[PDB]
Amino acid sequence: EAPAAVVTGAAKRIGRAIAVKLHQTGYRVVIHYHNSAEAAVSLADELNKERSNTAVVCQADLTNSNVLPASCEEIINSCFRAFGRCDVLVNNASAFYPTPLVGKTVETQVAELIGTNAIAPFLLTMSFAQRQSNLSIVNLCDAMVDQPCMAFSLYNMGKHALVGLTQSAALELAPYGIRVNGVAPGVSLLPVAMGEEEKDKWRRKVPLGRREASAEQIADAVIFLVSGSAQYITGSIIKVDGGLSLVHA
Amino acid sequence: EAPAAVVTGAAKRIGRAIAVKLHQTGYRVVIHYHNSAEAAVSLADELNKERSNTAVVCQADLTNSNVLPASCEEIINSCFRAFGRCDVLVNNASAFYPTPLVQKTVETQVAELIGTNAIAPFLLTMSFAQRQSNLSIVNLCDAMVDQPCMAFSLYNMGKHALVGLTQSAALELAPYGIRVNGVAPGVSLLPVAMGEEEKDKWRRKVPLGRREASAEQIADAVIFLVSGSAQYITGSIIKVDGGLSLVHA
Amino acid sequence: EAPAAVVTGAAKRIGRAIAVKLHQTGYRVVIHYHNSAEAAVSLADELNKERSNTAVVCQADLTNSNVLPASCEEIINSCFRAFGRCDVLVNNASAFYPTPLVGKTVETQVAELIGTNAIAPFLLTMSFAQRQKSNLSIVNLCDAMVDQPCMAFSLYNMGKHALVGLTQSAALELAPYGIRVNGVAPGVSLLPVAMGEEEKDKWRRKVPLGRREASAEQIADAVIFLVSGSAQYITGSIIKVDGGLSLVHA
Amino acid sequence: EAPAAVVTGAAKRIGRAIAVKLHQTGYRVVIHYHNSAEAAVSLADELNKERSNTAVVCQADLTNSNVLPASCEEIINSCFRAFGRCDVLVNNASAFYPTPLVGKTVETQVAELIGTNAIAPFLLTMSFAQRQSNLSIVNLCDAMVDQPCMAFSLYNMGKHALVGLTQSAALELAPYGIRVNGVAPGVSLLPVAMGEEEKDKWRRKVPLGRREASAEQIADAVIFLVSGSAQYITGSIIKVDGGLSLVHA
Numbered sequence: 002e003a004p005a006a007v008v009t010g011a012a013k014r015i016g017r018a019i020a021v022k023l024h025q026t027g028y029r030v031v032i033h034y035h036n037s038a039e040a041a042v043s044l045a046d047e048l049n050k051e052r053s054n055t056a057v058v059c060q061a062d063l064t065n066s067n068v069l070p071a072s073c074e075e076i077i078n079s080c081f082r083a084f085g086r087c088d089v090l091v092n093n094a095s096a097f098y099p100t101p102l103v104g105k106t107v108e109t110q111v112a113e114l115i116g117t118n119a120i121a122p123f124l125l126t127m128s129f130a131q132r133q134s135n136l137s138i139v140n141l142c143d144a145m146v147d148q149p150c151m152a153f154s155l156y157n158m159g160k161h162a163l164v165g166l167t168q169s170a171a172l173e174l175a176p177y178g179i180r181v182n183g184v185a186p187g188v189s190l191l192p193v194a195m196g197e198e199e200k201d202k203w204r205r206k207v208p209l210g211r212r213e214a215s216a217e218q219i220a221d222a223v224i225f226l227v228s229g230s231a232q233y234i235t236g237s238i239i240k241v242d243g244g245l246s247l248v249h250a
Numbered sequence: 251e252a253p254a255a256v257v258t259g260a261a262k263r264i265g266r267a268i269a270v271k272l273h274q275t276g277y278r279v280v281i282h283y284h285n286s287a288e289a290a291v292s293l294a295d296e297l298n299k300e301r302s303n304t305a306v307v308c309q310a311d312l313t314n315s316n317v318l319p320a321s322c323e324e325i326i327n328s329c330f331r332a333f334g335r336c337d338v339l340v341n342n343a344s345a346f347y348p349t350p351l352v353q354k355t356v357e358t359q360v361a362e363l364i365g366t367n368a369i370a371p372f373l374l375t376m377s378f379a380q381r382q383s384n385l386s387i388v389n390l391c392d393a394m395v396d397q398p399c400m401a402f403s404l405y406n407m408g409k410h411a412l413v414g415l416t417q418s419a420a421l422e423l424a425p426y427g428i429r430v431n432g433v434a435p436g437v438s439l440l441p442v443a444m445g446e447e448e449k450d451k452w453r454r455k456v457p458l459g460r461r462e463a464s465a466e467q468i469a470d471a472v473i474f475l476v477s478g479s480a481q482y483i484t485g486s487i488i489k490v491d492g493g494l495s496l497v498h499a
Numbered sequence: 500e501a502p503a504a505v506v507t508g509a510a511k512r513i514g515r516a517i518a519v520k521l522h523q524t525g526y527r528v529v530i531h532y533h534n535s536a537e538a539a540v541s542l543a544d545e546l547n548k549e550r551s552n553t554a555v556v557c558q559a560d561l562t563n564s565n566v567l568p569a570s571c572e573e574i575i576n577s578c579f580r581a582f583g584r585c586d587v588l589v590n591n592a593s594a595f596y597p598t599p600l601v602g603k604t605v606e607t608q609v610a611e612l613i614g615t616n617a618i619a620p621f622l623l624t625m626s627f628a629q630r631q632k633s634n635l636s637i638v639n640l641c642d643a644m645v646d647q648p649c650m651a652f653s654l655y656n657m658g659k660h661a662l663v664g665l666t667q668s669a670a671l672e673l674a675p676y677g678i679r680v681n682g683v684a685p686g687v688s689l690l691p692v693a694m695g696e697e698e699k700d701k702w703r704r705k706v707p708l709g710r711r712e713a714s715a716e717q718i719a720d721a722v723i724f725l726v727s728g729s730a731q732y733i734t735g736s737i738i739k740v741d742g743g744l745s746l747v748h749a
Numbered sequence: 750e751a752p753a754a755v756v757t758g759a760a761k762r763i764g765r766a767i768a769v770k771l772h773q774t775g776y777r778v779v780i781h782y783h784n785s786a787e788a789a790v791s792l793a794d795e796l797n798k799e800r801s802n803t804a805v806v807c808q809a810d811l812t813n814s815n816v817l818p819a820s821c822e823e824i825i826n827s828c829f830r831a832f833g834r835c836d837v838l839v840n841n842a843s844a845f846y847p848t849p850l851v852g853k854t855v856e857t858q859v860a861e862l863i864g865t866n867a868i869a870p871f872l873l874t875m876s877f878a879q880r881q882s883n884l885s886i887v888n889l890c891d892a893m894v895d896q897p898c899m900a901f902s903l904y905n906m907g908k909h910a911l912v913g914l915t916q917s918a919a920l921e922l923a924p925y926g927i928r929v930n931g932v933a934p935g936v937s938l939l940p941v942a943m944g945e946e947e948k949d950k951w952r953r954k955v956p957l958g959r960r961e962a963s964a965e966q967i968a969d970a971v972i973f974l975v976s977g978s979a980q981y982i983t984g985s986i987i988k989v990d991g992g993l994s995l996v997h998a
């Protein structure tokens with residue numbers, strides 16, 4: 002009987018790529034989504050047409066609040082309800098937007114950027130662990146956290162917190178046989194609303210090929226970390242950035 | 251006239267040593283505190299005896315909540331109301347306690363640990379910057395963040411987020427001439443409630459002299475970073491750890 | 500036609516496991532060695548028994564010297580001579596022993612530890628790149644514990660740090676030629692056969708993930724990933740394979 | 750009696766600023782140099798005019814070779830011969846030039862870049878420690894070593910090695926009371942042969958003031974690390990880079 006995985010923010014883009022590649026490897030998947038209901042259901046439909054009763058959707062807001070723990074617990078519960086087990090958690094969902102130091106309130110900005118990128122991963126990790134084979138968690142990090150975009154403090158804080166979670170949880174969950182690792186893209190699929198000229202400015206900075214990573218390339222590193230070929234790896238973050246983080250100003 | 255500094259959690263231990271040292275260097279000081287009212291008032295009294303009208307107290311809970319932004323605005327504002335300027339911010343206040351992944355409600359644990367260690371520092375940084383010469387911010391980090399204590403995930407997340415804030419704010423505030431740096435203790439004054447035997451266990455691990463840092467030694471590094479001797483340093487984090495972080499398991 | 504790989508220090512242990520997995524994946528290999536001559540020749544023999552003329556050996560001392568560049572060029576040359584191409588270089592060979600700051604001379608310690616761990620990797624990378632005439636890559640065997648080093652191993656540690664710098668520098672510089680450069684950083688893997696079990700257990704007990712050392716094959720699995728089409732966008736990265744060891748405070 | 754310091758490559762630029770400031774602080778100094786004999790003697794003359802018998806020169810090639818240990822041993826001996834003691838070692842001398850992977854031989858390139866930047870620091874460290882109040886070593890590192898200049902692999906290798914030495918020697922020498930630390934410039938005094946256009950190009954990248962560090966600014970951080978205000982600091986590398994290393998491509 003097939004293992005099962007939760008992928009957060011899996012309706013589109015990198016999360017969908019990761020859900021698809023896990024499914025093709027033999028996983029049943031929970032496709033978490035927030036606003037993208039149609040895309041989520043559409044993906045689950047495609048996956049179920051390939052193998053029946055192997056995909057489900059689960060809607061959750063991952064903004065920080067006093068109910069975020071309940072929400073995270075429910076996402077994990079959804080995997081146990083559909084599949085009877087939960088082998089892999091992929092923390093992919095991420096809010097990303099500028100929060101200049103010098104319109105959402107600042108309260109909202111902190112709640113969304115810290116909640117999605119860091120607090121929700123921690124609460125999902127807690128629920129995943131409490132409910133417990135090749136068990137692992139993969140966190141989607143950011144290769145450029147030490148050379149950040151100007152005016153993105155809250156986003157940067159959240160991704161650095163996520164690094165701290167990866168290490169702390171790797172350490173504490175190791176005795177339970179749960180590995181915890183990260184994949185850190187540089188530039189991968191560009192924002193939908195980004196103009197082509199602005200996309201090319203990013204592409205030209207990448208040493209390896211002057212192009213963004215495909216979603217599938219990101220997913221490839223996720224698949225490695227969840228596989229038997231990574232059974233000794235925990236607390237590691239693999240950059241998948243085409244050399245981008247190595248380029249000086 | 252004399253420059254002014256806000257020091258958070260400045261009633262006792264390291265924050266106290268920082269407040270004293272800045273005051274001895276010629277700063278007027280706001281001593282922020284949460285529960286230690288008697289100690290804070292007592293410190294202001296002692297400093298004011300040295301030089302009249304140079305120390306005040308400001309009480310605030312730095313727990314994350316929808317009122318935290320207003321609280322942080324108020325702290326900065328207290329420095330302006332007392333001293334008519336605010337030249338230095340020291341983010342020292344910190345909650346610290348275990349938050350096991352497998353085990354106060356979880357939402358309280360999040361609010362306290364992430365609020366004090368990261369979100370309060372971000373909001374203070376915003377309030378400080380907006381209100382704006384040798385301007386700088388010093389964040390109290392942690393030298394052991396990459397080799398964390400077992401079961402301290404939320405604390406570790408908060409301190410990693412603080413590293414992210416230090417970098418992101420250094421970059422963003424550099425055009426305004428505000429420097430942003432960190433000081434990362436290893437083992438300094440041990441928890442008052444920790445037994446002498448457990449304290450000795452940590453002391454024994456420290457290569458440089460088999461002892462913890464004094465609060466004064468931590469304050470020394472803060473003083474350097476705020477000084478004109480650090481005029482070109484921003485985005486740097488100075489460990490003050492006696493070599494502890496270099497020691498393998 | 501099959502690709503070809505050079506693996507340094509490939510006679511035994513992790514270098515051996517790397518050569519074997521590459522060979523199992525379809526690579527032709529050069530097994531470089533220094534003192535383990537019988538093990539190197541027998542390994543290549545067992546590989547050639549599996550598939551004819553798919554393995555050669557090349558002996559070289561990788562101590563720093565004025566002849567080291569020539570040796571390194573010859574190692575790369577031996578891959579082109581045998582197989583007509585060189586797709587993969589694995590810098591695996593390593594000297595490891597204490598060099599306290601406070602039976603070899605210091606100049607010998609410098610030459611062996613900096614030579615094998617850093618200078619020879621640089622010189623091999625140079626010859627590798629220059630000889631290029633679809634998936635080219637270099638993998639450098641780093642060390643997960645380089646920021647929490649063993650007492651009295653300054654030269655070793657300096658060599659492994661330099662190796663980090665080479666991985667980054669060569670990744671940036673070689674990216675325009677489509678050559679990826681990455682690292683694998685073991686924590687504790689195969690401990691010396693001769694180390695007492697009670698000593699081995701001291702190390703094993705410190706590892707979070709299973710209180711055991713990595714197998715050689717576990718280390719090789721990461722190299723195999725980095726050289727594969729699943730890692731085509733990865734360059735300049737160093738994957739720790741340490742079971743959480745570098746996370747553990749003193 | 751006044752303490753004594755060895756500064757390598759001290760005839761010009763940053764090493765000169767370091768020797769000057771150490772001298773202004775009360776230290777007697779050994780001004781090591783390789784080719785700059787006139788500039789070295791001129792500097793010794795200025796310092797001895799200020800305080801007689803407080804400065805000496807010592808010539809040495811720091812290229813790697815089988816006699817480099819003897820040369821490093823002699824530099825340390827020259828401090829004992831002039832001053833009767835050796836309290837501080839500043840590893841400042843550095844060769845810097847491109848060594849592309851694709852008129853010096855490669856053997857020479859290796860010997861010069863790895864010897865000056867790494868092996869000579871190790872051998873000086875060894876001799877410093879073997880001949881042994883407030884003892885310390887300060888290594889001049891490089892803030893940009895993780896985002897290196899294209900075609901500078903040997904230089905980068907040497908500076909990364911120097912980080913490893915800083916850590917390993919801090920750990921090993923701590924029991925003897927010798928601290929070991931680093932200062933990592935970003936862009937400071939720009940090279941002798943660089944056009945105005947190219948100087949401005951680098952200046953423009955620096956967040957904090959769009960200018961390079963002064964030699965004195967670099968020296969200020971060295972002074973801090975050897976001072977009594979740094980007595981618990983060992984194994985630390987302080988970036989002095991005006992935020993340069995924080996800037997993405």
Ligand SMILES: NC(=O)C1=CN([C@@H]2O[C@H](COP(=O)(O)OP(=O)(O)OC[C@H]3O[C@@H](n4cnc5c(N)ncnc54)[C@H](OP(=O)(O)O)[C@@H]3O)[C@@H](O)[C@H]2O)C=CC1
Pocket residue numbers: 009010011012013014015016033034035036037038061062063064092093094095096097113117141142143144185186187188189190191
């Ligand atoms: N793409 C890139 O270039 C890079 C990506 N990364 C990281 O890789 C991962 C994937 O990147 P990418 O696919 O571009 O991510 P996206 O920006 O496309 O976001 C992924 C999903 O996050 C979900 N999400 C956003 N806000 C919330 C919220 N409040 N509650 C719940 N879910 C929410 C959304 O779900 P929905 O649509 O259902 O609302 C969204 O589809 C991220 O973690 C990202 O930070 C790192 C660096 C670069």
Ligand SMILES: NC(=O)C1=CN([C@@H]2O[C@H](COP(=O)(O)OP(=O)(O)OC[C@H]3O[C@@H](n4cnc5c(N)ncnc54)[C@H](OP(=O)(O)O)[C@@H]3O)[C@@H](O)[C@H]2O)C=CC1
Pocket residue numbers: 258259260261262263264265282283284285286287310311312313341342343344345346362366390391392393434435436437438439440
């Ligand atoms: N001591 C050490 O060994 C180490 C220290 N550090 C860092 O150095 C800094 C100072 O350390 P140390 O002096 O030991 O710290 P403490 O643990 O003594 O905490 C400092 C102050 O933080 C304040 N604080 C705690 N919770 C809150 C809250 N909810 N709202 C507002 N303020 C709050 C308290 O104020 P009050 O008393 O008024 O209630 C407390 O006195 C901290 O940031 C710490 O993380 C890092 C590594 C180790």
Ligand SMILES: NC(=O)C1=CN([C@@H]2O[C@H](COP(=O)(O)OP(=O)(O)OC[C@H]3O[C@@H](n4cnc5c(N)ncnc54)[C@H](OP(=O)(O)O)[C@@H]3O)[C@@H](O)[C@H]2O)C=CC1
Pocket residue numbers: 507508509510511512513514531532533534535536559560561562590591592593594595611615640641642643684685686687688689690
């Ligand atoms: N095993 C572990 O726990 C760890 C391993 N590593 C790294 O992993 C890699 C593989 O480790 P492992 O298999 O244990 O390494 P070994 O200690 O077994 O050494 C690997 C090979 O290096 C060769 N070598 C040594 N000196 C020279 C020299 N002067 N000239 C040429 N070749 C030489 C030897 O070849 P010969 O036998 O033919 O003389 C030896 O077999 C190394 O780079 C190592 O540093 C990192 C962390 C820990």
Ligand SMILES: NC(=O)C1=CN([C@@H]2O[C@H](COP(=O)(O)OP(=O)(O)OC[C@H]3O[C@@H](n4cnc5c(N)ncnc54)[C@H](OP(=O)(O)O)[C@@H]3O)[C@@H](O)[C@H]2O)C=CC1
Pocket residue numbers: 757758759760761762763764781782783784785786809810811812840841842843844845861865889890891892933934935936937938939
């Ligand atoms: N300046 C900057 O922007 C940056 C500097 N740094 C580091 O800061 C330190 C000082 O920088 P800077 O003053 O610009 O350095 P320089 O390039 O000016 O060199 C310092 C001295 O090193 C000596 N040196 C060079 N080769 C040898 C050799 N073979 N043997 C002995 N001594 C030798 C030279 O002495 P002589 O003149 O007597 O021949 C030279 O004057 C260096 O370690 C450098 O890497 C780091 C990053 C940036």
Ligand SMILES: Cc1cc2c(cc1C)N1C(=NC(N)=NC1(C)C)N2
Pocket residue numbers: 094095096097143145187188190191192203
């Ligand atoms: C550089 C960079 C980093 C990113 C990033 C885009 C770019 C260009 N993304 C990040 N997170 C999320 N959630 N979405 C997007 C907008 C695609 N991180």
Ligand SMILES: Cc1cc2c(cc1C)N1C(=NC(N)=NC1(C)C)N2
Pocket residue numbers: 343344345346392394436437439440441452
């Ligand atoms: C190792 C260690 C890390 C610390 C730490 C103590 C120890 C032993 N402290 C931290 N933060 C806060 N707020 N207080 C205290 C308890 C003093 N970090």
Ligand SMILES: Cc1cc2c(cc1C)N1C(=NC(N)=NC1(C)C)N2
Pocket residue numbers: 842843844845891893898935936938939940951
């Ligand atoms: C970026 C940069 C890094 C440097 C550097 C200059 C620049 C611009 N220098 C380095 N080391 C030595 N020895 N001299 C010089 C040339 C001044 N490192």
